């Protein structure tokens, strides 16, 4: 079957110098949270921004089916923590990275499990 590869398209578009998706919904919070990647309430630490999840989901924002047989969205209804250094492109960040299934931190941005 033919299916649009939306993730590859955004990644290629970024590399080509396209402006990252904007209007991701950044939350006010204490910035004293756990720092885990995807949480039921904002959990940014001092090095992170917390965003409304739907607004950082490429599939939600571009009105395309989620890459999941169930069509279930990982981010909608939750909050995603983005390193402040990457918060200019929360959608790119969530797309290009992965959450540790053990500690819940972003691999390489908080996960200390291979230490």
Query: Which parts of this chain interact with another protein (CB under 8 A)?
Result: 23-30, 40-42, 49, 52-55, 57, 60-61, 63, 76-79, 87
Q: How far apart are CA 65 and CA 5, in angstroms?
A: 11
46 binds, among Zn ion, another protein, none (CB under 5 to 8 A by kind): none
Is 62 labeled as ligand-binding?
no
- Among 39, 58, 60, 59, which residue's Cα sits nearest to residue 50? 39
User: Per the annotation, does 63 bind a ligand?
Assistant: no
Q: How many residues sit close enough to Zn ion to count as binding (CB under 5 A)? A: 10
Angstrom distance (rounded) from CA 69 to CA 11: 23
Residue 78 and residue 38 in contact, taking contact as beta carbons nearer than 8 Å: yes
Taking CB under 5 A as the criterion, the residue among 20, 29, 60, 97 binding Zn ion is 60
Residue 57 as a binder of Zn ion (CB under 5 A): the answer is yes
Question: HSE-up of 1 (CA within 13 Å, CB side)?
Answer: 3
Nearest to 22 by CA among 106, 87, 115: 87
Tell me whether residue 11 or residue 26 sits nearer to another protein (CB atom).
Answer: 26
Kindly state whether residue 59 participates in binding Zn ion, applying the rule CB under 5 A: yes
Binding site members for Zn(2+)? 57, 60, 66, 73, 100, 103, 111, 113
């Amino acid at each position: 079957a033919f299916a649009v590869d939306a993730a590859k398209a955004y990644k290629d578009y970024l590399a080509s110098g396209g402006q990252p998706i904007t209007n991701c919904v950044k939350m006010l919070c204490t910035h004293t949270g756990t720092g885990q990647a995807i949480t039921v309430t904002p959990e940014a630490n001092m090095d992170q921004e917390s965003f409304g999840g739907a607004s950082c989901c490429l599939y939600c924002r571009c009105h395309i089916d989620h890459p999941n047989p169930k069509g279930f969205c990982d981010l909608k209804g939750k909050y995603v923590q983005i390193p402040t250094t990457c918060a200019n492109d929360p959608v790119g960040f969530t797309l290009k990275n992965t959450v540790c299934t053990v500690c819940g931190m972003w691999k390489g941005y908080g996960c200390s499990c291979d230490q």
